[PDB]
Design an enzyme around this catalytic site. Sequence first.
Site, PDB file in Angstrom:
ATOM      1  N   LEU A   3      -3.090   6.268 -15.358  1.00  0.00           N
ATOM      2  CA  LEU A   3      -1.899   5.879 -14.609  1.00  0.00           C
ATOM      3  C   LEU A   3      -2.179   4.706 -13.675  1.00  0.00           C
ATOM      4  O   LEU A   3      -1.423   3.734 -13.638  1.00  0.00           O
ATOM      5  CB  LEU A   3      -1.385   7.061 -13.790  1.00  0.00           C
ATOM      6  CG  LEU A   3      -0.700   8.192 -14.553  1.00  0.00           C
ATOM      7  CD1 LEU A   3      -0.518   9.391 -13.642  1.00  0.00           C
ATOM      8  CD2 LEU A   3       0.639   7.698 -15.077  1.00  0.00           C
ATOM      9  N   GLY A   4      -3.265   4.806 -12.919  1.00  0.00           N
ATOM     10  CA  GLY A   4      -3.620   3.746 -11.996  1.00  0.00           C
ATOM     11  C   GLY A   4      -4.888   4.075 -11.237  1.00  0.00           C
ATOM     12  O   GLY A   4      -4.896   4.954 -10.377  1.00  0.00           O
ATOM     13  N   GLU A   5      -5.965   3.364 -11.556  1.00  0.00           N
ATOM     14  CA  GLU A   5      -7.258   3.577 -10.910  1.00  0.00           C
ATOM     15  C   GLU A   5      -7.347   2.915  -9.541  1.00  0.00           C
ATOM     16  O   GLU A   5      -6.587   1.998  -9.230  1.00  0.00           O
ATOM     17  CB  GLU A   5      -8.382   3.052 -11.806  1.00  0.00           C
ATOM     18  CG  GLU A   5      -8.555   3.828 -13.107  1.00  0.00           C
ATOM     19  CD  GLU A   5      -9.534   3.162 -14.058  1.00  0.00           C
ATOM     20  OE1 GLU A   5     -10.661   2.844 -13.615  1.00  0.00           O
ATOM     21  OE2 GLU A   5      -9.181   2.961 -15.244  1.00  0.00           O
ATOM     22  N   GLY A   6      -8.286   3.389  -8.727  1.00  0.00           N
ATOM     23  CA  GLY A   6      -8.473   2.836  -7.397  1.00  0.00           C
ATOM     24  C   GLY A   6      -9.817   3.223  -6.804  1.00  0.00           C
ATOM     25  O   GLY A   6     -10.685   3.744  -7.508  1.00  0.00           O
ATOM     26  N   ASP A  64       0.596   4.800   5.506  1.00  0.00           N
ATOM     27  CA  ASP A  64       0.297   3.707   4.585  1.00  0.00           C
ATOM     28  C   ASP A  64       1.470   3.421   3.662  1.00  0.00           C
ATOM     29  O   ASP A  64       1.312   3.264   2.453  1.00  0.00           O
ATOM     30  CB  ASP A  64      -0.959   4.007   3.764  1.00  0.00           C
ATOM     31  CG  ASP A  64      -1.510   2.760   3.065  1.00  0.00           C
ATOM     32  OD1 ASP A  64      -1.630   1.707   3.728  1.00  0.00           O
ATOM     33  OD2 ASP A  64      -1.822   2.833   1.850  1.00  0.00           O
TER      34      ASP A  64
END
Length: 269
Positions: free
Chosen positions: A14-17, A129
């Site tokens: 989905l979305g790495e970080g 955030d």
Amino acid sequence: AVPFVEDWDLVQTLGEGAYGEVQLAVNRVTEEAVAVKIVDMKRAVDCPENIKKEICINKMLNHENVVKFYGHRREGNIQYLFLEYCSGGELFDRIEPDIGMPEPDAQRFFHQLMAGVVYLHGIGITHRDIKPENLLLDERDNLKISDFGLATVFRYNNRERLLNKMCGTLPYVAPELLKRREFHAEPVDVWSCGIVLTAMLAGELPWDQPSDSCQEYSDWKEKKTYLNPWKKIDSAPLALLHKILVENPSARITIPDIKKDRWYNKPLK
Ligand SMILES: O=C(N[C@H]1CC[C@H](O)CC1)c1ccc2c(c1)Cc1c(-c3ccc(-c4ccc(O)cc4)cc3)n[nH]c1-2
């Protein structure tokens, strides 16, 4: 008990970080899609307590404008967080670079944003955030606040607690967080939402950080809304930004007072 339901096929990323990765998982028996975060417990001196707070905070949340929390699986270092899947994507990707989006969509998205924040605040929690990439959308296009890895409760037993910890993202952070030792949490989230509104209406960020050393910030303080980035914003919603993006947090508009703002209750527009 239906067999195999426990099984979740990890379809795709989905979305790495910094944390690790978040894969999309679809139920083996019901095909119910979900989002699974993988918090790498790696190392032992700045990883443990981090996710432990993030989890207890999620166990509280429950609002239609906050990613839904399902459960958490432990296994040594690999911790699995099960959260609602948002096929809609990030609000970020609905913002046309340098243009923004149709004013009506912005007003709609802002409404859901406030609903979610009012809620979080209601139960004494601050996200800390808030930004387009942390605001998700689902199939119906309903805004969802997500990522509470930085949230912290600021009110417990009806006792507010001033914050002093600096965190967030420079372009969305509030000015008093760079010039004061302590500050109220609620107002800092309002400033964030404010910066998101401008991003939606103009497609660009007003400044790298809210500090006088920064050009655009000093100009805005001088109210040079002409030609500059606020030139793309109509005067109605622009009046709301004048009230939100106010330096002195004590003189900064409160959410309860934003619900009363003219542009906020303007039909379609
Ligand atoms: O923006 C996205 N894709 C882009 C499409 C255009 C292309 O140009 C590049 C990729 C996209 C699609 C679907 C997405 C996301 C992001 C993030 C996300 C999530 C997602 C949901 C919740 C949390 C999360 C919630 C609470 C917490 O304490 C920590 C983390 C993290 C991530 N679910 N489904 C999706």
